[PDB]
Structure 1
Amino acid sequence: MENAHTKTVEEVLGHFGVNESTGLSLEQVKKLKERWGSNELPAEEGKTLLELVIEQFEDLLVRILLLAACISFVLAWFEEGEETITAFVEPFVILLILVANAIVGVWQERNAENAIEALKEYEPEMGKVYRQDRKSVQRIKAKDIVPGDIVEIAVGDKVPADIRLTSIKSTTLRVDQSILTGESVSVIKHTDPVPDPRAVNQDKKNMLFSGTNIAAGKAMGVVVATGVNTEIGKIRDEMVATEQERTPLQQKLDEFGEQLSKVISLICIAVWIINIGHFNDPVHGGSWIRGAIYYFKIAVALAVAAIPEGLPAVITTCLALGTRRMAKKNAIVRSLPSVETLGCTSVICSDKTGTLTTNQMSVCRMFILDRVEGDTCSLNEFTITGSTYAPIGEVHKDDKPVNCHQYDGLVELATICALCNDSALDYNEAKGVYEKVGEATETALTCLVEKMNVFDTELKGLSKIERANACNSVIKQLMKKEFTLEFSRDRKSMSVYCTPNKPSRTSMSKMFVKGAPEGVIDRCTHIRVGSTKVPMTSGVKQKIMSVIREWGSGSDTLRCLALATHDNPLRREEMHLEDSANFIKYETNLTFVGCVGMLDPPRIEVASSVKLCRQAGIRVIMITGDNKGTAVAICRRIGIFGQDEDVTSKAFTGREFDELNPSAQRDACLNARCFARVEPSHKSKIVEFLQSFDEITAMTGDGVNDAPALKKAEIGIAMGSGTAVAKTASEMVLADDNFSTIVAAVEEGRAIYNNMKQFIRYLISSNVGEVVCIFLTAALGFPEALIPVQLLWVNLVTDGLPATALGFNPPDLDIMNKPPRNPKEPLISGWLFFRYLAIGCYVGAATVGAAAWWFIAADGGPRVSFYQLSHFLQCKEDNPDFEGVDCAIFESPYPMTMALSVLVTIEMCNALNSLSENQSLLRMPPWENIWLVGSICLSMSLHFLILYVEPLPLIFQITPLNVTQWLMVLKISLPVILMDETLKFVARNYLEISWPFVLLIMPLVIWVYS
């Protein structure tokens, strides 16, 4: 079987020896699964190791350090090129920090992608087949499908394998195959063969390809290729890589990194042009170009220092962390940066059926017309026991066991339910439960027909399997279903044309209609009382609607459907079934038979999740296609409304929302919390009206009618048990159907953004202190305290792991107690610009003050005055101002070591400030981030290494410090913590305690300041 689209249906079915009615035998499946194997693709990993490392060096900030590492190599290859431990130390320490951030970024990306692919194994994919063991449709694993078995295909499903369409149950079958073809339109499929043998997949209009979705209709066909033999498995690796639009924060940090790179270039140019006079200094040898090259190395070393080279890697780590944390809560995040968009979400739009409710429906109430006395009527209401899809339960009229065969209206009510279905009941021996095959609404009617048993059948000896479709089969054996007018949300109903297998001479053909109660009743001209029909008056109409309103608004919040019959329908030849808009013109002059009400319990997690969303400034909206009275009743149950709150202006329908003023329709989206009776076209219209008011919308849906709205939203969340049409159009899938995972994703989206601002706060406020150190020494005339190899060491220990370990920060204790941020506001927000300069001005003056301390106040050095330090260049033995001062001490490595040690230590104490924007160290101690504590102890260990081993101080031109000089370093480095505690204090109490830590920090403060 190679060209299946060229052969007809009878030839492709005879190739395997299959009947479309029965299906494939169990022995045939065993033989075919041996010859063809499992129906799956080999589990391949996304990106290799080298290509994952290559994408770490693709940003501007990282590519700048690569250029400077090359400059430091070419400009040092001329001077010294023999020893590799004293000459090329500058290019080595610029690369060593790039590899460190590349390793962490790759390590976290490997963890996020290994966690997501381990979540695809959560629940196995399923496919409805027809096999000979069961005389009905059974749901089996998708990987258990062999080439040649009959497969049932319904709307919303995902095609499990390459399928040659044998018959189309609906009038039209649409398939969304952008995954394979690339077309963004639904394509109509037919049964006739395509004569062209070399036809492209575009012209294969009779084949269903694995991985594609069903946009509309129901059909069935025979599988012709499984596993890697499908058109999607043969090009599984030869596929173009996706590229999505940059989210507002992704482009924010990109434009911020470029604006920062321009400022750094002006700062490094300013370094070269203010040190013009020092070019001809005797220290360089009296040469101008020799002194200009040296101060060019300083400009380059300060560029590497002041640049946040770790910003691209920390964004990668944060996004990979949030993705791995959601996968722990069973949330497959399809787009890595999309977990950030849920942080700034303002509105959460939610599908009702299947998303806010468990979709475990059960018919618990139904009524038919008892009699008519005048214009009004009396009804026969019933109750059904049971809430599971198991066909175990009986019907009670007024709390009395009754048999449905006595009531003629119930016999016709079960006939409409059984025949007007595209669903069935399936028994699972593995789990020992009854499962649904199709939609929960139609399966609830299948389980109802089994309980009623209007044609009393002996069910005492049937198996658990055959008892799932026992009474349903008795109905279908009596009436032959000719064609179905499939359910369309334009008319909100579904009709079926049936002809009795009984001789047609006495009994004619009828149409069995079912759909929305208010829509179907408006099209009913007569009503069925018992076995006779009388014309429908008005008093019957409001009396019937009154029971439907009391059921939806009642204590059970019942989902209601009306059942009708059309006794005099047009024949098939006089019906134009090409357009779906004509179907409502055929479902007129019906005969109202009955109305069923089923219960759909909301999920347990939904009630508390709506409360936490309201606490975090988020507004939850219910956009459902169901009735308004039912939707409002559910909103009061889950907490969207109050049990007594007025919803006259907060609950709207599809019609009411259309018939609104521009001012009224503006205030509606800003105040309405429930939208009922809205088509899939209206749902996306609600979403675009919310985004028109500059609001990040998060749509949650599970069905076909939510797919246009899941794409119009900034981020769409899909339930794991919903259709694949919705899971394809979404950015996050809740594999476990947990609604609490949605609020956990909002907290993770806010926490990711917080860790970025703490990374931005630590590097800007500390690297500007390394710039002030270079410029303040020049404005005072002091000997410069740093050389290019020391500006590159402070870049390694301070901008490396202590900066990346900020992406592991724990969340604030009130992270979810603040309104969502405005995504169009500026990033740094002005008041933080003051906090960056306030801390940076101290970090710079502390470094210059540490070098000036040794020249003046230290005992190990000279007691040089301020005048002799400001004019050290003017010192020779001829000068009477400089007497007794050995002016070779102005080149001593002691002030350079005091400044380098303070710069490292004051930036480690600044990393301890960057755990929260406003929470002090007494509330969030440093051991909340254990990765930051380990990174700081590692950076200090590396600083103590180059200080006290033998050959390293000569490389970095430093000297070992004693305890007396190290105690002075902490005296200047510690007040950077006290300075940020003051800035956090003003932020808490004017712009808006861990005692174990206090007992540890004060013995250090006692020893430092004596």
Structure 2
Amino acid sequence: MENAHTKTVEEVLGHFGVNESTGLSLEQVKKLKERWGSNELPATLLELVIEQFEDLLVRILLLAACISFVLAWFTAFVEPFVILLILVANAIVGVWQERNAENAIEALKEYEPEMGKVYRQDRKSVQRIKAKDIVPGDIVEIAVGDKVPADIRLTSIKSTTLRVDQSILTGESVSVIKHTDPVPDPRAVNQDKKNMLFSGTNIAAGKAMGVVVATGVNTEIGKIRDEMRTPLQQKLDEFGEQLSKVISLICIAVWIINIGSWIRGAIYYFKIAVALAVAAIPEGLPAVITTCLALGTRRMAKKNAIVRSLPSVETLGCTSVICSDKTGTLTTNQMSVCRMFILDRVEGDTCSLNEFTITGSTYAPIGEVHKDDKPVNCHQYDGLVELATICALCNDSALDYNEAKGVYEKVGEATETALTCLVEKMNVFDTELKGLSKIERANACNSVIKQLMKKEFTLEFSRDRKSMSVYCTPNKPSSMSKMFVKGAPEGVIDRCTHIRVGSTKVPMTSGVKQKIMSVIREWGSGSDTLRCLALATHDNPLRREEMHLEDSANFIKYETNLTFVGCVGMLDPPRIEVASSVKLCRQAGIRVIMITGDNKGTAVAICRRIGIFGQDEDVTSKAFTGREFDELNPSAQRDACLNARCFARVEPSHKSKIVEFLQSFDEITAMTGDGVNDAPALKKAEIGIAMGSGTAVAKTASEMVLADDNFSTIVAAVEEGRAIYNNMKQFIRYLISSNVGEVVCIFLTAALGFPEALIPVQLLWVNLVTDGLPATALGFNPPDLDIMNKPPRNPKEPLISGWLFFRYLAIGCYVGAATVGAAAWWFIAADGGPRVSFYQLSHFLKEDNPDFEGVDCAIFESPYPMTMALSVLVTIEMCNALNSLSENQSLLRMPPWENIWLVGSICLSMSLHFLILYVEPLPLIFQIPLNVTQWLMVLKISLPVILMDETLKFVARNYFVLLIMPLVIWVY
């Protein structure tokens, strides 16, 4: 079947020989799966390796590896080789971490098979099957929120209008409108295919059914499968540019003051200002950020949270407002009518009711109606036969038994599905239900109703009108059509001009209208926090011939002069872990707002339950309806958002505008939503969160999907986001505060006229050792002990602080007055070696010199005090690295064994530094045999940078040993 849209409806129905209302036979599926395979897709090798070197810091440090190798034919290659080993080492961590997380996100999406609603011949009702079991033939049904599972030709549209979001397939950011007439153009583009749906795209409004015409690869989305920065990064890429600007400054600022063949020898000092450049250049800044960001995506994918955009975690470390949809998201969406009432009698102003309770918290259609905790037969209550009529004929939902889980599931919206379940429990027509199975009883009594009443068309739901009409005619006429409605109570009773009392109608009164809203206030504020709907019927509707449904704004006009019948009260439990989250957030410095279209009375009562409010807290300033907000003065309407914690009876435009107002206050907002109404607010907010059980359009439009439906996962992402930015700051403090020393070790050396500090092969070794995997592995750092007890980060404030700058000199100056303080100790105050005086040492730049009496000028050509400064900078920078586990938490509170990966790193970079000083062929390649008398001093010197930085920690903070102390006692 090619170009179905050329062909008409019955044509494509003939091609598969299916009845539209029956669907595909059982072996017809067997054959067709043997002719088109499943409905799935079978999902570079070294490209990840090459992507690491695409960053500025390793693009330029790829040059220094070839510049010092330019001079190879002129040790010579040991300089460029050591620049590789720090670039190669960091580049391997990232590709490792990246492939770790990749499998994870692909492990979680695979957990949940995408179901899809078909019409095979076994069950007389719609049923949910795995997407891959769909074949080109069976009738398929979809509705608002559903992703399309296969390529479908439309056959019938139940709602007035159908709206598909084809963005993922075509890119058009608008919802198109479909039809069922044939498009003749046989080469028409996907966008001009207005009678077809395609996998992966979602339904924005309406509900319809068609027949599959392609699967797997043959679908438009499959046909093109093989042919297809972050807010913290721009903060670091404005940094990576600036340091190199100062690096190459200071570096060539070294190269000049030294030169003063006398010019061919000026190319030595070039490899210095080049190697010293690589030394104070963070080769691993772009690797350590791709590391941590990949890690979190793996951390979250572990907790049943698919992260769809990588900066989601980063921004969540700063969120100060987390708005959330009530129904579905903050509630389990496990609905069942447990209270209902109709009118008993009405005499004058006063009136009485006939209330009822109904058992059964599950969607399962088992339960009984009580009057006063006593069961009753509903046929005796004439008003109940009608409430039951409305509740099954205004339903776009249906019950579907899941024989795998042995439990009942919903087909459509939970709210509607609770009603289908209720009309089963009533059985107002007293049909004999004894001989029917767990599947026949999912939609049993509705069928009797739907068999007595011909539903000719429905006027679908509209969240601004907040009600849903249905047109019907009895099957034996003579012409007596009627109209049934169900909608928001406040709204429906507004349009109700009459009330039915049993089987008779009477005009609406003030007092009657009162009682209703009190029951509903009783119901929504009670221990159950009921979610209530009104149910009324129009007795003299306008003929279908004289109706105008092209403009849906007419719908509310036709739903007028109604007869009120009754109200239902369904229960909705809050999610279990939710009351903890709002406790955890108010401590992390985060506000939690509720945005809902339901009753303010009920929405507040939930907020009282879960801890947004408390039963006694006055809420007059923190809860406003949609109307109570737009009907305010702009100043009070301003500081409302500042303090309001609940917004109810609210359309998606509001939630989109609510988040907007938060953001206009420089607030970083998160949005937690389940359904279509949350779609604008999800995109609008900085980050949107969708529920796994929710809709696809809610999931697609949002940027992180809790497939768990766990609500405490949100907090964990905020800890990840706060932990990633915090790992940077220490990593920042390490390389930055440690290289002020490598510059002063050189610049102090020049100012005092001292002997040579280092050599360009030594300059790039100590870069490798301290700035290789040791520095890099700082990203696995343990989250701080009090990370979620402090307000969130404000992104517009700068990265580095003036107290932190001061802490970089206080360790940069020290590691420099320690790198050169050890080489001067071997010339002035050492036992085995020269006793050169300070004056004699600074003017060393002759046998004739009487100031240099009794000294072989050859002692300045000795590698001894060079590895006294080389192994001091390695040891002291491993020490400073051990300071860099936390900004202020000392090593008494955060011991170094908590970070396993900086430990296993420092031990590897000392195993590679100790292997260089005592092996056979290396002390000559590196110009360098140090033992106990000298290694104790390098310990005596490199260790105080532990305490010196510790005393910085102790002062900013106020505004183990069995192992530690024997090591120090040897030293002193």
Tell me which interval the TM-score lies in, with the shorter structure as reference length.
Answer: over 0.9
What's the CA shift string for 1:516-565, capped at 9, x where partnerless?
A: 00001100000111111101111111111111111001111000000010
What's the CA shift string for 1:700-719, capped at 9, x where partnerless?
A: 00100000000000000110
The answer on whether the counterparts of 2:69 and 2:76 sit within 8 Å (CA) in structure 1 is: no
SS at match of 2:354: strand
User: In 1, Cα distance between the equivalents of 2:615 and 2:926?
Assistant: 73
The answer on whether the counterparts of 2:198 and 2:219 sit within 8 Å (CA) in structure 1 is: yes
User: Are 1:955 and 2:921 matched, yes or no?
Assistant: no
The answer on whether the counterparts of 2:778 and 2:902 sit within 8 Å (CA) in structure 1 is: yes
The answer on whether the counterparts of 2:818 and 2:872 sit within 8 Å (CA) in structure 1 is: yes
SS at match of 1:402: coil
User: In 2, Cα distance between the equivalents of 1:364 and 1:784?
Assistant: 88
What's the CA shift string for 1:886-941, capped at 9, x where partnerless?
A: 11111211111100000000011111111111111122111101111110000001
User: In 2, Cα distance between the equivalents of 1:42 and 1:322?
Assistant: 27
Structure 2: give runs of 5+ residues left out of the alignment.
none
What's the CA shift string for 1:323-343, capped at 9, x where partnerless?
A: 111111111011122211111
Determine which of 968, 977, 980 is the counterpart of 2:949.
980
The answer on whether the counterparts of 1:527 and 1:533 sit within 8 Å (CA) in structure 2 is: yes
What's the CA shift string for 1:760-807, capped at 9, x where partnerless?
A: 011101122111111111111111221111110011110011111111
Match of 1:242 in 2: none
User: In 1, Cα distance between the equivalents of 2:829 and 2:20?
Assistant: 98
The answer on whether the counterparts of 2:231 and 2:311 sit within 8 Å (CA) in structure 1 is: no
User: In 1, Cα distance between the equivalents of 2:921 and 2:98?
Assistant: 38
The answer on whether the counterparts of 2:91 and 2:287 sit within 8 Å (CA) in structure 1 is: yes
Distance 1:77-1:580 versus aligned 2 partners, 3 A rule: farther
Structure 1 position 50, deviation (Å):
2.1
User: In 1, Cα distance between the equivalents of 2:4 and 2:801?
Assistant: 63
Match of 2:517 in 1: 545
Structure 1 position 31, deviation (Å):
1.4
User: In 1, Cα distance between the equivalents of 2:626 and 2:277?
Assistant: 60
Match of 1:82 in 2: none
Match of 2:936 in 1: 967
Distance 1:860-1:290 versus aligned 2 partners, 3 A rule: farther
Match of 2:969 in 1: 1006
User: In 1, Cα distance between the equivalents of 2:58 and 2:606?
Assistant: 53
Structure 1 position 723, deviation (Å):
0.3
User: In 1, Cα distance between the equivalents of 2:45 and 2:172?
Assistant: 33
User: Are 1:185 and 2:185 matched, yes or no?
Assistant: no
User: In 2, Cα distance between the equivalents of 1:703 and 1:11?
Assistant: 36
What's the CA shift string for 1:392-430, capped at 9, x where partnerless?
A: 000001111101110011000000000001110000110
User: In 2, Cα distance between the equivalents of 1:49 and 1:894?
Assistant: 48
Structure 1 position 249, deviation (Å):
1.1
Structure 1 position 288, deviation (Å):
2.7
What's the CA shift string for 1:603-637, capped at 9, x where partnerless?
A: 11001111001110011110011110010000011
Structure 1 position 461, deviation (Å):
1.2
SS at match of 1:817: coil
Determine which of 230, 239, 247 is the counterpart of 2:230.
247
What's the CA shift string for 1:83-125, capped at 9, x where partnerless?
A: xxx3211111111111111110000000011111000122111
Structure 1 position 667, deviation (Å):
0.4
What's the CA shift string for 1:670-723, capped at 9, x where partnerless?
A: 100000011011110000100000010000001000000000000001100100
The answer on whether the counterparts of 2:278 and 2:764 sit within 8 Å (CA) in structure 1 is: yes
The answer on whether the counterparts of 1:247 and 1:341 sit within 8 Å (CA) in structure 2 is: no
The answer on whether the counterparts of 1:566 and 1:591 sit within 8 Å (CA) in structure 2 is: yes
What TM-score, normalized to structure 2?
0.99
What's the CA shift string for 1:567-617, capped at 9, x where partnerless?
A: 111111211111121111111111101110100001110011110011100
User: In 2, Cα distance between the equivalents of 1:672 and 1:234?
Assistant: 50
The answer on whether the counterparts of 2:880 and 2:945 sit within 8 Å (CA) in structure 1 is: yes
The answer on whether the counterparts of 1:122 and 1:735 sit within 8 Å (CA) in structure 2 is: no
User: In 2, Cα distance between the equivalents of 1:697 and 1:260?
Assistant: 33
Determine which of 45, 50, 53 is the counterpart of 2:49.
53
User: In 2, Cα distance between the equivalents of 1:376 and 1:522?
Assistant: 19
Structure 1 position 153, deviation (Å):
1.0
User: In 1, Cα distance between the equivalents of 2:88 and 2:311?
Assistant: 23
SS at match of 1:202: helix
The answer on whether the counterparts of 1:773 and 1:847 sit within 8 Å (CA) in structure 2 is: yes
Match of 2:809 in 1: 837
SS at match of 1:743: helix
User: In 2, Cα distance between the equivalents of 1:20 and 1:288?
Assistant: 95
Structure 1 position 291, deviation (Å):
3.0
User: Are 1:401 and 2:336 matched, yes or no?
Assistant: no
Structure 1 position 247, deviation (Å):
3.2
The answer on whether the counterparts of 1:622 and 1:673 sit within 8 Å (CA) in structure 2 is: yes
User: In 2, Cα distance between the equivalents of 1:337 and 1:780?
Assistant: 49
Determine which of 449, 453, 465 is the counterpart of 1:491.
465
User: In 2, Cα distance between the equivalents of 1:587 and 1:951?
Assistant: 94
The answer on whether the counterparts of 1:413 and 1:593 sit within 8 Å (CA) in structure 2 is: yes
User: In 2, Cα distance between the equivalents of 1:256 and 1:719?
Assistant: 37
The answer on whether the counterparts of 1:422 and 1:438 sit within 8 Å (CA) in structure 2 is: yes
Determine which of 342, 348, 353 is the counterpart of 1:374.
348
What TM-score, normalized to structure 1?
0.95
User: In 2, Cα distance between the equivalents of 1:574 and 1:339?
Assistant: 55
**CA RMSD between the two structures:** 1.0
The answer on whether the counterparts of 1:703 and 1:723 sit within 8 Å (CA) in structure 2 is: yes
Structure 1 position 28, deviation (Å):
1.0
Distance 1:152-1:576 versus aligned 2 partners, 3 A rule: same
Structure 1 position 382, deviation (Å):
0.4
Structure 1 position 55, deviation (Å):
1.9
SS at match of 1:166: strand
User: In 2, Cα distance between the equivalents of 1:669 and 1:891?
Assistant: 73
The answer on whether the counterparts of 1:162 and 1:207 sit within 8 Å (CA) in structure 2 is: yes
User: In 2, Cα distance between the equivalents of 1:582 and 1:426?
Assistant: 34
SS at match of 2:116: strand
SS at match of 1:460: coil
User: In 1, Cα distance between the equivalents of 2:208 and 2:683?
Assistant: 26
User: In 1, Cα distance between the equivalents of 2:305 and 2:703?
Assistant: 10
Structure 1 position 374, deviation (Å):
1.2
Structure 1 position 831, deviation (Å):
1.0
The answer on whether the counterparts of 2:68 and 2:76 sit within 8 Å (CA) in structure 1 is: no
Structure 1 position 344, deviation (Å):
0.6
User: In 1, Cα distance between the equivalents of 2:71 and 2:542?
Assistant: 92
User: In 1, Cα distance between the equivalents of 2:466 and 2:107?
Assistant: 40
SS at match of 2:340: strand
Matched positions, count: 972
Match of 1:135 in 2: 124
4+ residue segments displaced more than 6 Å: none
User: In 2, Cα distance between the equivalents of 1:49 and 1:836?
Assistant: 41
User: In 1, Cα distance between the equivalents of 2:943 and 2:401?
Assistant: 70
User: In 1, Cα distance between the equivalents of 2:595 and 2:416?
Assistant: 21
User: In 1, Cα distance between the equivalents of 2:876 and 2:443?
Assistant: 76
The answer on whether the counterparts of 1:172 and 1:188 sit within 8 Å (CA) in structure 2 is: yes
SS at match of 1:926: coil
Q: Select between 50-59 and 633-642 the one with higher mean Cα deviation.
A: 50-59
User: In 1, Cα distance between the equivalents of 2:748 and 2:618?
Assistant: 66
Match of 1:946 in 2: 916
SS at match of 2:338: strand
User: In 2, Cα distance between the equivalents of 1:574 and 1:769?
Assistant: 88
Structure 1 position 216, deviation (Å):
0.7
What's the CA shift string for 1:431-475, capped at 9, x where partnerless?
A: 000111111000000000000000111111111100111101111
The answer on whether the counterparts of 1:108 and 1:317 sit within 8 Å (CA) in structure 2 is: yes
Counting only pairs closer than 5 Å after superposition, residues 288-303 of structure 1 correspond to structure 2 as: 288-303=262-277
User: In 2, Cα distance between the equivalents of 1:720 and 1:814?
Assistant: 31
Structure 1 position 49, deviation (Å):
3.1
The answer on whether the counterparts of 2:520 and 2:532 sit within 8 Å (CA) in structure 1 is: yes
